Structure formats: C-alpha cells, structure tokens
C-alpha cells in the first residue's frame, strides 16, 4: 500500500563515505524496480543471481540498500569474490552475493575545484572485513610493536585516507555514487513485494 523509499537512497543529496557506508532497511512496502533498470543515468548495473526485470514479481522478507562514494577505478571492487583496498577494508560482498550493484558518475555533485576531501576510505586494517561488515574505527593503526597512545608518528598511521576529488581529474579518479541492493528471504512473512 506504500511505496518502498528507493528515491531517498538513489537521489539523496549527500552520500556516505565508503568506510562508513549507509544502509537503508526496506520493509513492509511495495517496490517498483522498473524505475531503476529502465533509467539511463546509470553507468554500471551489475546483478548477481537475480534479474532486475524479475524483481517486480517477487517477494522478500527484507531488502537492504547500501550507498557510498568511491573512485571510478574502485567500482569493479564492488562485486563477489573481489580483492582490493575497498573490498578488503571498506565494503565487502559475499562470494554468493544475490543482488545488484548500481553505480553512476557524480563528478558534478561530489567534486569541487581545489579538491573535495570529505569522502574517506580505510587504508590500514590488520584483517579483511567480513561480508556486509561496517568498521568506523578511527583509532591510530599500530604498525609496529610500540603502542601508539593515540598520536600519529613512526609506525603509527591514521587508518583513514581522503579522496582528492577534483573535477578535472580522469574518469577513474572521479567520484562515483554506488548503491548495492541486497535481497533477504528469512522464511518469515514477506513484506517487500512488487506491484500486483
């Protein structure tokens, strides 16, 4: 009886940094996925294990939409069985991922002359992230045997790094807004269905 709030996610004025990626829980609504795949603003629409054209006639207990901003070169890291700084330390998809990865260039929105340094990514982590794990820690990364005591220095690196988003940079360097759709069937009563 109520539309699923996909517009709040895809058209949001501000997107989160990839290390602190947002997640929108979608429940108890009717979703019209046609407004997504029939669009022309998307440069990447990669789905695994499900067809978007077949989503308007399926029911799920819950749907999750994750949003963040990364470089163009790192968009290929948002995929099952992928490896890299984004895939290992910021946002990780499972090997059996069932959902869609949607990306589009946002150089006009997320880039400014002189550099937009508001978007961050995690650079150092001792172990890879689990699938769908969010790590927002800002503690000094201890690269040696000496405790850092919260001050950056030798063998003590700040775990986060800033993107230097400038509008004149190459396409791979330009910011890209990414939305990842996750579809969950918990064998509970389903509340996220398509139109009837």
């Amino acid at each position: 009886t109520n539309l699923c709030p996909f517009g709040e996610v895809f058209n949001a004025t501000r997107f989160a940094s990839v290390y602190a990626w947002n997640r929108k829980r979608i429940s108890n609504c009717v979703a019209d996925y046609s407004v997504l795949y029939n669009s022309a603003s998307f440069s990447t629409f990669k789905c695994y294990g499900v067809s978007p054209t077949k989503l308007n006639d399926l029911c799920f207990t819950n749907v999750y939409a994750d949003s963040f901003v990364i470089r163009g070169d790192e968009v290929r890291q948002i995929a099952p069985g992928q490896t890299g700084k984004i895939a290992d330390y910021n946002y990780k998809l499972p090997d059996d991922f069932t959902g869609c990865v949607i990306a589009w260039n946002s150089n006009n929105l997320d880039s400014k002359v002189g550099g937009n340094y508001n978007y961050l990514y995690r650079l150092f982590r001792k172990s890879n992230l689990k699938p769908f794990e969010r790590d927002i820690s800002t503690e000094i990364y201890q690269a040696g045997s000496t405790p850092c005591n919260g001050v950056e220095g030798f063998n003590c690196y700040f775990p986060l790094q800033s993107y230097g988003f400038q509008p004149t940079n190459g396409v791979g360097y330009q910011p890209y807004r990414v939305v990842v759709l996750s579809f969950e069937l918990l064998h509970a009563p389903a509340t996220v269905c398509g139109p009837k």
């Epitope: 890299g84 201890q142 400038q166 940079n169 190459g170």
Partner: antibody
C-alpha cells in the same frame, strides 16, 4: 630503527625456480604492506608484487602466474617464490616496506638474481 | 599504464648551487607522486611523498612541488654527496610506475 635484508639470490638456469627471503625488523610484517621492486642492471625500477596488510596479493602483468609473494608472521620474513624464470627477469630485487600500496619508505640493500644458461 | 618522463636525462652542477628536476606524467595523478634518491651501489631512499611532504631525516634543502601531471624536485645548496640518480614514482592508478631517472653529478 628498521632493517630489511634480502637473501636467496644467485645464478639460475632459465625456466628454473628461485625463492627470495627478506628478514624484517623494526615493524610488524603482518600489519604492513610489503612489496618487491626489481631493477635490471643499469636500468630503472620496476614494481613486481605487493602483499596488503590484510594478506591480499597483487602482481605485475609481466610476472603474474610465475611469481608468488608470501609472508611468515612467526619468522617475520617476506618471501618471493619465482618460477619459470626468464632471461629478462635478471635484476636486483629489492625488499621494500610499502605505505598503503602508495610509496616505498624503507628499502633493503637488495639481492642479485642472474638468469642465464 | 601511466608513463613518467623525467627531464633532464642528466645534470651537472657545482656544490652550493640549486638543482631543479622535472617529471611529467601521461595522465594527471593529483599529488599521488613520490621522489627517490639512489646513490651508486645502494638502495633508493625516499625523499618526497605526496609531491610536497619530506620524509623523516631528510634535510629541508630538498623540496618537492607540483600537482596534476607537472612535478618538480628542488635541491638547494648542493653538496658533493648529492650525486645520485633521482626517480619519480606515481601511485595514482595501478600498476605503479617509475620514471627513467635523472643522473646528477657534482662539478669541481
């Protein structure tokens, strides 16, 4: 103080195998990016492979499928397993501490690998 | 790949003078660049990272500048031990690539 000492270089016939070792002190090997960088005799520097702090590994296109980089936390040692060696692989191989897959702030003195019949 | 070009191919100056080294890239890398000094028989030593920041233990006379695809290494009040090959390396995109170096000798 940081020390990087390479070993395992020497003469090897083409198509053979050679394993390089890099002992490291002054930092935690398992917590840092580490790279191998090679320099052909009299020529410039070329990046070979990297291992991320989380264990992820990447290789240059010229050595992929033949080289394998690895680490041993207990021994605090970085390894470079070289297989199917070619004449063009003749170079001085440098162990290098890598800052976030960006730049090499510490270098070992290097070990010489000569591939010849 | 991204190709780094260094100019001059070689340079020759007296002690106490200022050296200006250049490095141009195929594409813009937006300060994702570093400079190394390699004296004969020795491993490269990191001088500049981020195209502006000096590494620890490096004298202030070494100076890095530039951004985009234009980069400059400035070395002031030269000393006889500053003879080495200087490389620029970029980490804007993979694979990381180096320049061909700049041979800098000390006159007398």
């Amino acid at each position: 103080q940081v020390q990087l000492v390479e070993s395992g270089g020497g003469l090897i016939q083409p198509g053979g195998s050679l394993r390089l070792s890099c002992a490291a002190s002054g930092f935690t090997v398992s917590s840092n990016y580490m790279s191998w960088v090679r320099q052909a005799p009299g020529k410039g520097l070329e990046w070979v492979s990297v291992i991320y702090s989380g264990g992820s590994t990447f290789y240059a296109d010229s050595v992929k499928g033949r080289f394998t980089i690895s680490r041993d936390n207990s021994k605090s040692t970085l390894y470079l397993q070289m297989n199917s060696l070619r004449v063009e692989d003749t170079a001085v191989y440098y162990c290098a501490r890598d800052f976030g897959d960006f730049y090499f702030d510490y270098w070992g003195q290097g070990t010489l690998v000569t591939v010849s019949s | 790949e991204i190709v780094l070009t260094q100019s001059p191919g070689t340079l020759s100056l007296s002690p106490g003078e200022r050296a200006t080294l250049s490095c141009r890239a195929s594409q813009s890398v937006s300060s994702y660049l570093a400079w190394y000094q390699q004296k004969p028989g020795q491993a490269p030593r990191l001088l500049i990272y981020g195209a502006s920041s000096r590494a620890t233990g490096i004298p202030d006379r070494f100076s890095g500048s530039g951004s985009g695809t234009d980069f400059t290494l400035t070395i002031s009040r030269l000393e006889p031990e500053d003879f080495a090959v200087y490389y620029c390396q970029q980490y804007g995109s993979s694979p990381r690539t180096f320049g061909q170096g700049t041979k800098l000798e000390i006159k007398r």
